[PDB]
């Protein structure tokens, strides 16, 4: 795709989220860069409204799959880059098992040479002392597969996957993800065969940062198609 050529080097990234979870209103700003040649993302997020009222790990998936590494032989399946620069809408329902849900609506597009992810997040039905509002999730992140299928009537894709957040007691908080993406612009976009994204993520803290924040290093490779 024409879109793919926008990702052959290092691309600056901005993330901006406004959220309301059970009436706790908050905002997050993030900055970093992506190098899709290596499936590589580095991002630092800051809660600009004070303390984040949900655990940072629960927002990782919401906070740019155009930075996935699609192997050359899978280039024709890369919807995300093909929608660029005009971008795509990315919507999800994230269902925390035995707890509340997030509904997210994001637009991912270029502003100049910078790839921007602007998100609105709404969370409802959370338990006041569940794992989310009670801040019982470990500050770490597991590796997951994102299963992608075409959504031809929307000129886009959908995805399903299961995120597992480690709980401080050693248990796991499941977050089921359902996802739909739709292109914003009028260029041709790629409608993929079934495949998945193999994701690994590492969370850290900036020792000099006293605002509430998260540093994310992530690697993503598309897979599941051999030819
Ligand atoms: Mg700012
Ligand atoms: Mg075929």
Numbering used by the authors: 2 to 64, 68 to 231
Question: Can you list sentences taken from the study reporting this PDB entry?
Answer:
Green fluorescent protein (GFP), discovered from Aequorea victoria, emits green light after absorption of blue light. GFP has a β-barrel fold, and the chromophore is formed at the center from the three amino acid residues Ser65, Tyr66 and Gly675,6. The protonation state of the chromophore differs between the two states, A and B. The phenolic group in the chromophore is protonated and neutral in the A state, while it is deprotonated and negatively charged in the B state. Spectroscopic measurements of the photoreaction of the A-type chromophore revealed the presence of the excited state proton transfer (ESPT) reaction, and a photoreaction model was proposed that includes the intermediate (I) state in addition to the A and B states.
The crystal structure of the T203V/E222Q variant at pH 8.5 was determined at a high resolution of 1.2 Å where the respective non-hydrogen atoms can be observed separately. The diffraction precision index (DPI) for the average coordinates error was estimated to be 0.07 Å. The quality of the electron density map was sufficient to distinguish between nitrogen and oxygen atoms and between carbon and nitrogen atoms. Thus, the conformations of residues such as His148, Val203 and Gln222 around the chromophore could be accurately determined without ambiguity. The Nδ1 atom of His148 forms a hydrogen bond with the Oη atom of the chromophore. The Nε2 and Oε1 atoms of Gln222 make hydrogen bonds with the Oγ atom of Ser205 and the Oγ atom of Ser65 in the chromophore, respectively. For the distance between Nδ1 of His148 and Oη of the chromophore, average-strength hydrogen bonds were observed in the T203V/E222Q and T203I/E222Q variants. To investigate the interaction around the chromophore in detail, the optimized structure with complemented hydrogen atoms was modelled from the crystal structure of T203V/E222Q by the QM/MM method. The atomic structure of wild-type GFP in the I state (IT) was modelled by the QM/MM method from the crystal structure of the T203V/E222Q variant at pH 8.5.
